[PDB]
């Protein structure tokens, strides 16, 4: 997730470093879901 | 919407009763797809 972009991750989620992922992705808010968190999960509460 | 709780559109989505079939539709916001607006389209 481009560090730089500011803005990537949508749905006021922030880009960083997700060590259970170990990796650098979009750590999205509480029900979204999503490469940069486009979808919602409505089944997710 | 006459529903009394809001949130049946996610994303600033308006919602509407259509009677001849007793269904709730919603007005989505632009770029958001879904039957309650939950997707983003990019």
């Known amino acids: 997730?481009?560090?730089s972009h500011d803005g990537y991750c949508l749905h006021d989620g922030?880009?960083?470093?997700?060590e259970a992922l170990d990796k650098?992705?979009?750590?999205c808010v509480?029900?979204?879901?999503g490469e940069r968190c486009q979808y919602r999960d409505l089944k997710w509460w």
């Open 30 to 33: 509480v029900g979204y879901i």
């Open 14 to 18: 922030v880009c960083m470093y997700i």
């Open 24 to 27: 650098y992705a979009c750590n």
């Open 1 to 3: 997730c481009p560090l």
